């Protein structure tokens, strides 16, 4: 039986690609409840890992919205291997304004993981007439789309780089590009720039490709 | 449960750049039910009501809803001059009519810089190679990118959406996949870009071994 209009809305978010691929980092799944009325502000949360109920989840303080509604957030810390092995995370939301609870289930994108191929491209000859040059990192053939990409030099993330969102390729895998902008003088002086990638299908979940003149 | 949703789309970038082509703003209404027999559209250009839009007949979807589209032909000059287009959707089950507005992004237009990049030496182990077209420093984000080789179009390409850069301009990349043999043979490939801030709204950059 479906809910009538004007009731709460539930959005379930996956952990960050980086958090799942580093044992030091803590990956978490996020259950966000919107359109929570003032008349019925209490939201109850029930979490399930492959159908088995858990209790470690924390409910964040309810944020007051400009549109006169409440945003209620539940944060569940997940085990790195549990998320990667494809375990289903169910968030159950109970509220007085609801006729029946809303249930959202999140899992790592199903499908054979595919190893990204990482390629660094120097600036086009035509760009060498400019004050700033572009160093390109092509990351392709990866699955799922969850990836972390960074341009760095001398152990510093570079101040001026941008990465495109992943794009679905014709073979069902994904690709993206990350554009690093540097002053031409730094490129002409032989400084080494590196594109660092983290993905579940890379050996040791990490690869680094470096480029220089 | 929440009824219809409206999505208002800009014209195709190539349509606004070629006088021979007809640019249109499209007001799409989804989640229209069998109990929504009428879907009325009111259109405004800079808040002034216009009457030239055409509604297409409702189209049933596989999720048992209908999709209702209204198309408004726009002048190339009006879109490019930043006129605002508003679509208002109503019927007797819409106590609050739905309004959406669209216009070309405000700011000084900037010329795209087009750069072709060969495959990385590392990619030459694979049977298929990537030819890259970097298009940067353009404004607004409306742009068209295609590939050609020996007069004919190359269609085995994928282009990223425009990305907002650190200086307020946009960039994108277009990736053309070719068999290594075609690249090793010395065949010339071309990346063509259509944008308002290019000569005759078009430019082309070639790439060969």
């Amino acid at each position: 039986a479906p809910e009538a209009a004007g009731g709460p809305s539930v959005f379930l978010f996956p952990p960050k690609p980086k958090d799942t691929l580093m044992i030091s980092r803590t990956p978490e799944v996020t259950c966000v409840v919107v359109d929570v009325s003032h008349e019925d502000p209490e939201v109850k949360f029930n979490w399930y890992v492959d159908g088995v109920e858990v209790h470690n989840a924390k409910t964040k303080p309810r944020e007051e919205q400009y549109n006169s509604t409440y945003r209620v957030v539940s944060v569940l810390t997940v085990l790195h291997q549990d998320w990667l092995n494809g375990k289903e995370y169910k968030c159950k939301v109970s509220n007085k304004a609801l006729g029946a609870p809303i249930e959202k289930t999140i899992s790592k994108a199903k499908g054979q993981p595919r190893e990204p191929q990482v390629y660094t491209l120097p600036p086009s000859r035509d760009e060498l007439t400019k004050n700033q040059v572009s160093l390109t990192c092509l990351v392709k053939g990866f699955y799922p789309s969850d990836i972390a990409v960074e341009w760095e030099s001398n152990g510093q993330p570079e101040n001026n780089y941008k990465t495109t969102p992943p794009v679905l390729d014709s073979d069902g895998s994904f690709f993206l590009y990350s554009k690093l902008t540097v002053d031409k003088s730094r490129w002409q002086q032989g400084n080494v720039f590196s594109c660092s990638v983290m993905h579940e299908a890379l050996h040791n979940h990490y690869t680094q490709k470096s480029l220089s003149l | 449960a929440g009824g219809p949703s409206v999505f208002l789309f800009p014209p195709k970038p190539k349509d606004t750049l070629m006088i021979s082509r007809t640019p249109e703003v499209t007001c799409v209404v989804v989640d229209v039910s069998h109990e929504d027999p009428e879907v009325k559209f009111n259109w405004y250009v800079d808040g002034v009501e216009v009457h030239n839009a055409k509604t297409k007949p409702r189209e049933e979807q596989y999720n048992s809803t209908y999709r209702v589209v209204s198309v408004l032909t726009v002048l190339h000059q009006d879109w490019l001059n930043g006129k605002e287009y508003k679509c208002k959707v109503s019927n007797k089950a819409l106590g609050a009519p739905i309004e959406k507005t669209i216009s070309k992004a405000k700011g000084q237009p900037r010329e795209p810089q087009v750069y072709t990049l060969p495959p990385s030496r590392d990619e030459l182990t694979k049977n298929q190679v990537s030819l890259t077209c970097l298009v940067k420093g353009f404004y607004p984000s409306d742009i068209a990118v295609e590939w050609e080789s020996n007069g004919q179009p190359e269609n085995n390409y994928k282009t990223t959406p425009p990305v907002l850069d650190s200086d307020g301009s946009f960039f994108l990349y277009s990736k053309l996949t070719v068999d290594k043999s075609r690249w090793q043979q010395g065949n010339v490939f071309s990346c063509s870009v259509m944008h308002e801030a290019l000569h005759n709204h078009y430019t082309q950059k070639s790439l060969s071994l």
Partner: antibody, heavy 119, light 110 residues
């Protein structure tokens, strides 16, 4: 919370005129159509009319179109009903009614204001 | 103008299914009539239940549903509750005006 509060009711002489108000709060009043509906003693509901958010269209029960004038002032979050040359049959509770965003056109009702037409 | 007719009164019992109807004097009730249903409780407390033939207002229980049956509009209550005791009005849209029916008083037995 959606709130509609009618005012301006009371005693009016036959042949008299009266203007009712409906103060809205808890929502963006400028987004919605608004209705006026009445209920005379021992009778059912009778629609009076409605007004678009921008006031470009005002609809009325055909038989009542020369007896009532609907208007609104979005900046003041207020709906109005001008009643002119009232008769005994106009004695009734007058309700302002807001549709929900989608679906129910008579969703949110004020408590009503009683107009008594009497000498 | 057009006249809208409903049953004067109907009786049901807790857990039963009851159907209220709404007829148009102009002929068959269509989706273009955007049938509406309103519930009236004591102290003149009105709440809209349905609009656009079958769309429930926010907070309306799932036991209330709207539909069209051939030439009439209908409000079905599936698994009636004692709290459903009320007067139910229907309203139909006629191109430029709404017309309310006479209302149906619902008695819940037991």
């Amino acid at each position: 919370e959606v709130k509609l509060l009618e005012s301006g009711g009371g005693l009016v002489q036959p042949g008299g005129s009266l203007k009712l108000s409906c103060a809205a709060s808890g929502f963006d009043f400028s987004r919605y159509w608004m209705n006026w509906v009445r209920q005379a003693p021992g009778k059912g509901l009778e629609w009076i009319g409605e007004i678009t958010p921008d006031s470009s269209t005002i609809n009325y029960t055909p038989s009542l179109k020369d007896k009532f004038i609907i208007s609104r002032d979005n900046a003041k979050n207020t709906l109005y009903l001008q009643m002119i040359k009232v008769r005994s049959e106009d004695t009734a509770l007058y309700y302002c009614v807001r549709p929900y965003d989608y679906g129910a056109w008579f969703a949110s009702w004020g408590q009503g204001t009683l107009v008594t037409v009497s000498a | 103008q057009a006249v809208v007719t409903q049953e004067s009164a109907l009786t049901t019992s807790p857990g039963e299914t009851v159907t209220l109807t709404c007829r148009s004097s102009t002929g068959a009730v269509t989706t273009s009539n955007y049938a509406n249903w309103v519930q009236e409780k004591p102290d003149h407390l009105f709440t809209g239940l349905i609009g656009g033939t079958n769309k429930r207002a926010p907070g309306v229980p799932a036991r209330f549903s709207g539909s069209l049956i051939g030439d009439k509009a209908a409000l079905t209550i599936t698994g009636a509750q004692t709290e459903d005791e009320a007067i139910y009005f229907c309203a139909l849209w006629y191109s430029n005006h709404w017309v309310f029916g006479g209302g149906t008083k619902l008695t819940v037995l037991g």
